Design a protein around this ligand. Structure first.
Ligand SMILES: [Mg+2]
Ligand SMILES: [Mg+2]
Ligand SMILES: [Mg+2]
Ligand SMILES: [Mg+2]
Ligand SMILES: [Mg+2]
Ligand SMILES: [Mg+2]
Ligand SMILES: [Mg+2]
Ligand SMILES: [Mg+2]
Ligand SMILES: [Mg+2]
Ligand SMILES: [Mg+2]
Ligand SMILES: [Mg+2]
Ligand SMILES: [Mg+2]
Ligand SMILES: [Mg+2]
Ligand SMILES: [Mg+2]
Ligand SMILES: [Mg+2]
Ligand SMILES: [Mg+2]
Ligand SMILES: [Mg+2]
Ligand SMILES: [Mg+2]
Ligand SMILES: [Mg+2]
Ligand SMILES: [Mg+2]
Ligand SMILES: [Mg+2]
Ligand SMILES: [Mg+2]
Ligand SMILES: [Mg+2]
Ligand SMILES: [Mg+2]
Ligand SMILES: [Mg+2]
Ligand SMILES: [Mg+2]
Ligand SMILES: [Mg+2]
Ligand SMILES: [Mg+2]
Ligand SMILES: [Mg+2]
Ligand SMILES: [Mg+2]
Ligand SMILES: [Mg+2]
Ligand SMILES: [Mg+2]
Ligand SMILES: [Zn+2]
Lengths: 136, 79, 182, 49
RNA sequence: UUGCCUCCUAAAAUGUAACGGAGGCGCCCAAAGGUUCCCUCAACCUGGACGGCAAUCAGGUGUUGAGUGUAAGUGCACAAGGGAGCUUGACUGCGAGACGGACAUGUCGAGCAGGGACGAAAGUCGGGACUAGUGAUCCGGCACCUCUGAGUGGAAGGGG
RNA sequence: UUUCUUGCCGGAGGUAGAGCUACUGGAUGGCCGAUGGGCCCCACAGGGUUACUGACGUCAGCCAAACUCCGAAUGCCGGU
């Protein structure tokens, strides 16, 4: 449930989602990480569910890094309302992800359950992603 | 449910409207700007509203002078 | 055709003692006293500014030259203070006035201090600077006790050209204010 | 009205030439400045009506 | 909501809409005008009792982070910043030439003549460091004028 | 032919993109951490002798139509 404490302006236009991610293309906080493939809108609830999944499997050891923060807001009017008449209220905050961006980072000893937990996180995200190690 | 925004102002059509390398008349206005984006040089005067104009005939030349943007009018040679 | 006794002491023995005792490369590396500033801020002018005139009179009898009234550069709604009221007094002693005032202080006030235990050495900021604040204000002999109505503040400030704390120690101890021993 | 509109009149030829705005709360007294009156030919102080 | 001003949307000349996103305006200054001159902060470590976390502060790293009437925007430390001395150019008569416009509208401007302001003089003075603070037509009032005056002087009336 | 097109010459921008120990905000994990700018005994003197808080700094890695220490291709204006 990652939500920014405050934002200077509470509503923003439709973000551009074109191009290839340049920042955060390589993983360096730990050993293991996950890299995305397609363009997407990844929501804070999805981040929360994925982090819950990672910890819910890795248990005692290790720790998690998250390289993204869902601070981009989106509006939605309630149903049974004619279109127009101003903007709707913001419902969920999203983090726009570009291809190849590193989403989560792990540092746990053994490859078996490391890859297992990373896959556990993969299966909860809406877009394709792959395992990447610290070695290039 | 309604909105309280939606009002705006007019457009006063600001900006640089005379560029370098051309010939300008006496008293010709060069740049319309709010503050000091440009600065006066030789033969350049400043109006009440921080506009820049020419005092002499010639050709406008932009330049840089100690981290500043200044405009000048060179005395083009009489044919 | 006149020269103060403390200035005489400084130019005869204090500078040569300092010079020989720290072995400076040149002679005028001797530290020297720079400015003497005398002032105080009442703080209650936000409610009553009448006592500012009394503070001015007190300063006038203390230094002999007219003080100042200055405002506050910021507004504090919590203190019920906005920019524009005069907050305190100001006056400065310079030159012969420095030497005469330092004489008067060291020779009249410090011996008389009620329950004087000296002054600690540890109130410098590393380069020999020292301004500070006193139990009672009526202490100088130039002011009379019968005409005072409330305890206000007053000032005795000495400063140096000193580069750091070593010569601050040296010159302040040569001059001889009641430094504590620890 | 906070902002009365007062006119400035000349003396020798007595012409209501200039007009200016002022705050009567802050300026109870009359306005005293100098201006140039065109028909006179010389500067002469103006008094408000 | 209907007028005006600030920014973005506005795609690096101007422009460019929506019941798109954020805010303000129908003043103030006889000084907050003008001349000339003096000087530069705030951030900073320490404390004769209050007085402390901050009052004022000297020392002495400190190129703007304090700030420059009223929102935003641009600048301004080379000041448009603070103070002081004097004094009203918030002139008249204008206006080369320009921006700017469907049209009525808005903006700048060297120079000449009279009398001044500051400074010895050089020099500067056609409101406020700038951009919002605003309203067409008709009809009615007042001062002054070597304008006219329904057959004689006029005057009324009609004019500026 | 003053028009248009093209080559070259003289031009200011502030979009795309990228970036932050460069400003306005957002954000992940460490290190000394004196002094929570502070509390197991309040000593005017031994520590979270106790899992906190830990500022400044620092290691680094991101995001912003109303952020630009940077900044194109286009288009626009003028001359040959
Ligand atoms: Mg980046
Ligand atoms: Mg998926
Ligand atoms: Mg003006
Ligand atoms: Mg002006
Ligand atoms: Mg020093
Ligand atoms: Mg007039
Ligand atoms: Mg704008
Ligand atoms: Mg433009
Ligand atoms: Mg249209
Ligand atoms: Mg409003
Ligand atoms: Mg003045
Ligand atoms: Mg000082
Ligand atoms: Mg001024
Ligand atoms: Mg000033
Ligand atoms: Mg003309
Ligand atoms: Mg002129
Ligand atoms: Mg003249
Ligand atoms: Mg009508
Ligand atoms: Mg007749
Ligand atoms: Mg008749
Ligand atoms: Mg008549
Ligand atoms: Mg031809
Ligand atoms: Mg180019
Ligand atoms: Mg360029
Ligand atoms: Mg800009
Ligand atoms: Mg971009
Ligand atoms: Mg920063
Ligand atoms: Mg990086
Ligand atoms: Mg956009
Ligand atoms: Mg940008
Ligand atoms: Mg364009
Ligand atoms: Mg061409
Ligand atoms: Zn007259």
């Amino acid at each position: 449930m990652l939500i920014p404490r405050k934002v200077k302006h509470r509503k923003q236009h439709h973000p551009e989602q074109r191009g290839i991610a340049s920042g955060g293309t390589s993983v360096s906080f730990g050993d293991y990480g996950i890299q995305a493939l397609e363009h997407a809108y990844i929501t804070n609830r999805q981040i929360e569910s994925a982090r819950i999944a990672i910890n819910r499997h890795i248990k005692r050891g290790g720790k998690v890094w998250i390289n993204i923060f869902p601070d981009r807001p989106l509006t939605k009017k309630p149903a049974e309302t004619r279109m127009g008449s101003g903007k709707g209220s913001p419902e969920w905050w999203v983090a726009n992800v570009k291809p190849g961006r590193v989403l989560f980072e792990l540092s746990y000893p053994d490859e078996k359950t490391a890859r297992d937990a990373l896959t556990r996180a993969i299966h909860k995200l809406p877009i394709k992603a792959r395992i990447v190690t610290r070695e290039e | 449910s309604s909105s309280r925004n939606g009002r705006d102002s007019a457009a006063q059509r600001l900006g640089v409207k005379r560029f370098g390398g051309q010939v300008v008349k006496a008293g010709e206005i060069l740049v319309r700007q709010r503050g000091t984006h440009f600065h006066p040089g030789v033969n350049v005067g400043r109006g009440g509203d921080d506009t820049l104009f020419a005092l002499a005939p010639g050709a406008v030349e932009f330049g840089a002078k100690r981290g500043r943007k200044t405009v000048n009018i060179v005395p083009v040679a009489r044919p | 055709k006149a020269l103060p006794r403390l200035k005489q002491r400084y130019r005869e023995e204090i500078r040569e003692a300092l010079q020989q005792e720290f072995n400076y490369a040149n002679v005028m590396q001797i530290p020297g006293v720079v400015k003497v500033v005398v002032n105080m801020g009442v703080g209650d002018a936000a409610r009553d500014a009448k006592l500012i005139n009394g503070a001015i009179n007190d300063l006038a009898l203390i230094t002999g030259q007219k003080p100042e009234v200055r405002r506050a550069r910021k507004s504090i709604a919590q203190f019920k203070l906005r920019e524009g009221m005069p907050i305190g007094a100001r006056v400065t002693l310079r030159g012969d006035r420095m030497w005469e005032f330092l004489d008067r202080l060291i020779s009249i006030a410090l011996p008389r201090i009620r329950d004087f235990r000296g002054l600690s050495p540890k109130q410098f900021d590393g380069t020999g600077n020292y301004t500070f604040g006193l139990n009672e204000q009526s202490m100088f002999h130039e002011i009379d006790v019968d005409s005072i109505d409330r305890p206000r503040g007053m000032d005795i400030t000495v400063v140096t050209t000193a580069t750091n704390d070593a010569e601050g120690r040296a010159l302040l101890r040569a001059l001889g204010f009641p430094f504590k021993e620890n | 009205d906070v902002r009365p509109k007062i006119t400035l009149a000349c003396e020798v030829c007595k012409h209501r030439n200039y007009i200016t705005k002022k705050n009567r709360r802050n300026d109870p007294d009359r306005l005293e400045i100098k201006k140039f009156c065109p028909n006179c030919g010389t500067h002469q102080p103006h008094k408000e009506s």
